[PDB]
Design a protein around this ligand. Structure first.
Ligand SMILES: *[C@@H]1O[C@H](CO)[C@@H](O)[C@H](O)[C@H]1NC(C)=O
Ligand SMILES: *[C@@H]1O[C@H](CO)[C@@H](O)[C@H](O)[C@H]1NC(C)=O
Ligand SMILES: *[C@@H]1O[C@H](CO)[C@@H](O)[C@H](O)[C@H]1NC(C)=O
Ligand SMILES: *[C@@H]1O[C@H](CO)[C@@H](O)[C@H](O)[C@H]1NC(C)=O
Ligand SMILES: *[C@@H]1O[C@H](CO)[C@@H](O)[C@H](O)[C@H]1NC(C)=O
Ligand SMILES: [Cu+2]
Length: 150
């Protein structure tokens, strides 16, 4: 199972609820994290076990309340962070520049939900982060962005 370290999830981590859309926090929140478009951004998680496979899908709907909100015109998931295998437990952090995505609507002031998709042998697990993209972001502490060796 896993937790979002940054950007923060919609609500509290509940292990059993990770099998549901957005970890059962199905409605969008209004307390969004500002997320930079200048390439200083990242997504940081912590896993209790490894190996696991992780990626992220993205919705540019303000009201990202359903699976379909994360799908493109051709019915595929809008992949924000490509799936990869991770062989260490503890922290795992990937840089993320939304400017890299072939998606309409990525600009300053745009709202989005990043939904992390994880499988570690104990189900298909999900957590969601509601963000607002900003050209830049000031107080960003990149110190939580590390990969562990555990
Ligand atoms: C948003 O507020 C909710 C409810 O107070 C809280 O559980 C959650 O952690 C907050 N999200 C962020 C990104 O701080
Ligand atoms: C979430 O939003 C939907 C659609 O507006 C609504 O039917 C439902 O009552 C809401 N759920 C919660 C837990 O507030
Ligand atoms: C983006 O989300 C914020 C906070 O929930 C909200 O106040 C704002 O209206 C949203 N933007 C759009 C385009 O709906
Ligand atoms: C939709 O996303 C899928 C990946 O899940 C991709 O294969 C497909 O090309 C995308 N379709 C469009 C129209 O971008
Ligand atoms: C963590 O490892 C991944 C490769 O799985 C790498 O892309 C990423 O940049 C690393 N993060 C840090 C903070 O070194
Ligand atoms: Cu687990």
């Amino acid at each position: 199972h896993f937790q979002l370290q940054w950007p923060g999830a919609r609500g509290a981590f509940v292990a059993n609820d990770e099998v549901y859309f957005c970890g059962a926090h199905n409605n969008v929140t209004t307390n969004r994290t500002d997320f930079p478009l200048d390439g200083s951004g990242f997504v940081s998680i912590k896993s209790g076990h490894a190996p696991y496979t992780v990626g992220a899908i993205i919705s540019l709907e303000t009201d990202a309340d359903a699976w379909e909100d994360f799908k493109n015109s051709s019915g595929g998931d809008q992949i924000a962070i490509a799936y990869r295998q991770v062989d260490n437990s503890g922290t795992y952090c990937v840089p993320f520049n939304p400017s890299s995505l072939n998606i309409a609507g990525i600009q300053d002031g745009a709202n989005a939900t990043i939904q992390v998709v994880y499988t570690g042998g104990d189900g298909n697990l999900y957590q969601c982060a509601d963000v607002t993209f900003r050209t830049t972001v000031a107080n960003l502490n990149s110190s939580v962005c590390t990969n562990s060796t555990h």
